Amino acid sequence: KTCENLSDSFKGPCIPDGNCNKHCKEKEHLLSGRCRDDFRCWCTRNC
């Protein structure tokens, strides 16, 4: 199973390659991440 939670402080425009993933993957070492138009990013982790 996996859960989604708001990143720590992910800002700036997202890319089609994936910038929210490498972030939460290099920091929180999570599974992946995704950005939104609400200036908020969600990271997926095991739960």
From Swiss-Prot:
Please name every pair of cysteines joined by a disulfide bond in this record: 3-47, 14-35, 20-41, 24-43
Q: What is its main location?
A: secreted
Q: Which GO terms describe its biological process?
A: defense response to fungus; killing of cells of another organism
Sorted UniProt keywords: Antimicrobial, Disulfide bond, Fungicide, Plant defense, Secreted, Signal
Tell me if Magnesium is a UniProt keyword of this record: no
Give its localization. Secreted
Record-level GO cellular component terms: extracellular region
| Described purpose of this protein according to its UniProt entry | Does not inhibit trypsin or chymotrypsin.
Q: What family does the database annotate?
A: Belongs to the DEFL family.
Q: What is this protein called?
A: Defensin Lc-def
Please tell me the species this chain comes from.
Lens culinaris subsp. culinaris
The stretch of the full-length protein covered here is: 28 to 74 of 74
